[PDB]
Design a binder for this molecule. Structure first.
Ligand SMILES: OC[C@H]1O[C@@H](O[C@@H]2CO[C@@H](OCc3ccccc3)[C@H](O)[C@H]2O)[C@H](O)[C@@H](O)[C@H]1O
Ligand code: ADN
Ligand code: ADN
Ligand code: NAG
Ligand code: NAG
Ligand code: NAG
Ligand code: NAG
Lengths: 349, 351
């Protein structure tokens, strides 16, 4: 009667779902991530943020991405909509919100207290180990090898116990392709075209893969998801693809939950400028606003099972409820300027 | 420790009004493995019913009751005399549960085989009403004959030394009560012939009276009649169902009077199908996939049976019987296609 969790993970993925509704199958995978022994550790691909790559033990080896804690739970991030380090607790909260809203497009994420001295250093590749230092309080830290990584901006533990989030790596059978987001930001003081031209969506639905198929409706789904969590940093979106279709996946959601008082409505630009919305998601949104329990109350009950809970402060939770109403206003405004029959699109996905 | 779900909680949350079990092998294997290894905290037997059984309370955060049906025949015993004679076959409950999922009904509670050490697991926790029925046979095997209607000292269930083989059947939670109604196609259990045995137009009479005029009940009974025909269960004189606000469903409960004879096919069990010539659409779709797959129904069922602790479950004869009985079902429905058009035989109720 033995099934290993990494096998559950491999057989769980279809082209239009990364995770499933079954709490038994998902908790089984999460429990493995939370307790598997680390056999190898290195820096990873490249990226622009500080991360580590862990190889978890098993019949087959399963890689995860380690994003360490870099802020207090109640840090307020100010500046550009994409300011700050990657919030490790945002990756956890975004994963459970992904399932709570019925997207199921985010890989599993679990929090974990890592003993850097016992678990990481004995198996760390030289590329990663040479970046371990101590701070003025003799805590074990590492600053990593990346683009913005340097000796003066390390991630630091408590003594040797470092808190972070593990993100499950997709199997090789599901390669991840990446394309620039039509509504990407400029990342300088200029303005992107979608910030000056309110008819910008007309320009996008001309070129593939936005003229037909599910791509454009995916980006509108993800823009609603990104707006709720405050993720304004999806400049390149990523998707999986086989013979049966494609799907934009919610990967790297860590630049979220930076400020619980600001609502960057510019993230909703795909929705507000295109005024299209997949029907199945619209139905799930009306269930979230009609449920007796608010969206934040339901999300925290799922968050309460993670080892490093609390995941979000009350402010960020209440932000979700307020932003959900701001989404409903955006969609209802589309219903006025066009018509509900021309905004709600049923593609059976 | 984090992320823990107990199997009895998986079982409680798994049931909906139109499914007792789910397609997820992970959820099902988790529940089965718990039954196969959970420690028995209580064991008893009730004066009621007609068959020898025991009631086990399995350990856990909450206590979970199962029904224990002991082994009573060799694996290749042949039962003839009447379609419903014999003791309850423990291995039939196991095969019928996996056939229930293989065909996509999901109306049978989980069943697992298990070797019980009566001396170590049962006697220390046995209620006096059960312990007082323990005896020994001519070879000094540990046996018990129980308290029931047909139970007596001369017909006990006997182990090998003290290890008794049997089947555990999960008890449904209290939130899902089981109701019982007489099956319109009951047998007479005497030499008198039932009304459906003399009148081929009998289906007219049932769809007049409730609850067969409206709803899924009649189509459920047609589903289970196909299920019962494949396993050879001619003893469903009273069917049982669950019910809430969102509908009802006849469940495949107590399937032990099956797999008795691999050489006869009691087509009288198919009478609901052949006399009504109606068939739920989703059931027809799953049957045509079973007849078209390269692996026969018997090959697929044995692959699922091979995970049970007490495997082998069925002899080769009974497995080959399923494939032949499936063809007789396909013949029965195709015969309905001639006398009524296919557009009037297949009914789509989205179940
Ligand atoms: O030290 C980390 C640093 O991170 C900054 O976020 C970076 C900014 O650049 C984004 O990538 C922009 C881009 C790259 C390639 C092609 C197109 C666009 C990164 O995703 C993002 O993580 C952050 O703003 C700074 O505050 C600073 O904290
Ligand atoms: N869990 C993941 N699974 C597969 N590929 C990933 C994952 N996370 C990031 N990537 C990809 O690998 C690189 C790491 O930043 C990027 O190209 C990114 O798209
Ligand atoms: N798993 C079960 N769950 C609930 N009730 C059952 C179960 N098995 C048998 N019964 C009930 O107990 C009696 C068994 O002979 C019948 O009344 C039947 O409905
Ligand atoms: C934990 O931290 C301090 C240094 O911050 C160290 O002196 C102490 O010994 C550590 N505890 C153990 C058990 O090593
Ligand atoms: C989807 O594709 C998979 C393989 O990528 C295939 O096995 C399966 O049959 C397809 N699903 C459907 C519903 O056709
Ligand atoms: C079964 O039989 C032998 C003697 O017949 C005995 O020694 C053995 O211990 C018995 N098994 C158990 C489990 O007691
Ligand atoms: C019946 O279905 C509704 C909606 O699908 C659900 O809310 C309700 O809980 C179901 N009934 C019961 C008794 O759970």
């Amino acid at each position: 009667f033995n099934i290993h969790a990494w096998d559950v993970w491999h057989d769980m993925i279809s082209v239009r779902a990364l995770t499933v509704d079954s709490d038994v199958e998902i908790y089984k995978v999460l429990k493995a991530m939370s307790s598997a022994k680390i056999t190898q550790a290195t820096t990873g691909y490249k990226g622009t943020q500080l991360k580590a790559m862990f190889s978890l033990d098993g019949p087959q080896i399963q890689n995860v991405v380690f994003k360490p804690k870099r802020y207090s739970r109640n840090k307020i991030i100010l500046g550009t909509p994409y300011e700050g380090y990657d919030r490790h607790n945002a990756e956890i909260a975004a994963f459970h919100l992904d399932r709570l809203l019925g997207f199921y497009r985010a890989p599993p994420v679990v929090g974990r207290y890592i003993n850097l001295a016992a678990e990481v250093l004995p198996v760390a590749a030289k590329k990663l180990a040479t970046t371990f230092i101590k701070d003025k309080d003799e805590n074990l830290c590492f600053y990593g090898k990346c683009l913005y990584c340097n000796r003066k901006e390390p991630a630091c533990a408590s003594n040797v116990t470092m808190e972070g989030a593990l993100i499950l790596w997709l199997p090789e059978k599901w390669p991840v392709l990446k394309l620039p987001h039509p509504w990407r930001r400029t990342y300088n003081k200029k303005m992107a075209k979608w910030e000056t031209d309110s008819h910008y969506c007309e320009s996008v639905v001309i070129k593939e893969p936005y003229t037909k198929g599910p791509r454009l409706l995916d980006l509108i789904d993800t823009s609603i998801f990104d707006f709720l969590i405050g993720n304004a940093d999806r400049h390149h979106y990523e998707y999986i693809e086989n013979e049966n279709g494609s799907m934009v996946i919610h990967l790297d959601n860590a630049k979220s939950f930076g400020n619980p008082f600001v609502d960057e409505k510019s993230i909703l630009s795909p929705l507000v400028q295109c005024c299209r919305l997949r029907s199945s998601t619209y139905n799930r949104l009306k269930i979230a606003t009609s449920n007796e329990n608010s969206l934040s109350v339901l999300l925290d009950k799922r968050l309460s099972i993670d080892p490093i809970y609390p995941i979000l402060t009350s402010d960020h939770l209440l932000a979700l409820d307020r932003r959900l109403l701001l989404v409903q206003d955006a969609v209802e405004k589309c219903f006025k300027e066009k018509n509900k029959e021309n905004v709600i699109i049923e593609d059976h996905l």
